[PDB]
Amino acid sequence: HHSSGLVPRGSTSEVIEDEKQFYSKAKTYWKQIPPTVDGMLGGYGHISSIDINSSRKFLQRFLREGPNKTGTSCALDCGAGIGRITKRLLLPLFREVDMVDITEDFLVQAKTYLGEEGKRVRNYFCCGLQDFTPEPDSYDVIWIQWVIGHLTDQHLAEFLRRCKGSLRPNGIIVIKDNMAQEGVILDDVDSSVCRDLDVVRRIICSAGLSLLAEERQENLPDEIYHVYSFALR
């Protein structure tokens, strides 16, 4: 397996006019956001617990049931920010956690935010996912939440292929993100895209990942995009 995740090019978010600017505008945006839960959730800090509760139920099925249970030794939090998910979802379930995020200021704050259980965070990687290669055979769970909209379609596919090579036996990748009502929608404030369900499933499956589970998040505020979770390997 090519360790770079290379695949042939398929479809494109033609809503992304200039790829270099799509990435540089997002990096600039996050560099000035406050390193707080409110900053991570764009004013939706009030749904953080609801989000984490659903994620926990979703993941526990893979850790607790079946003949080929997913292990609990190590997880990778992709686009981790200050560690909201690492603190409340991953550290309680996995012995060690690695974090990767493009924003230096958030990795620095994460040391404070995570408190004492943060001593179980092994590595704080500062990298864009489009440039990041997780170590082979290292993670039981790779968690990718509210960040796939920051990658081009091609870089998303290649990143997931690199992730596949990083999973331990029985490991899974989880994507949890906003889904557009139709097509692909660019947010020019934070420089990210929202894609519809069919588009996302096609990116995953056409990248050669196997979709294991798919679940819509319930009980969210009426006014926001639907949020879905996918398990893949």
Binding site: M40, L41, G42, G43, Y44, I47, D51, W146, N178, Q181, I185, D187, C194, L220, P221, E223, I224, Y225, V227
Partner: peptide, 6 residues
Amino acid sequence: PPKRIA
């Protein structure tokens, strides 16, 4: 983040 339907 989660966000408002534009």
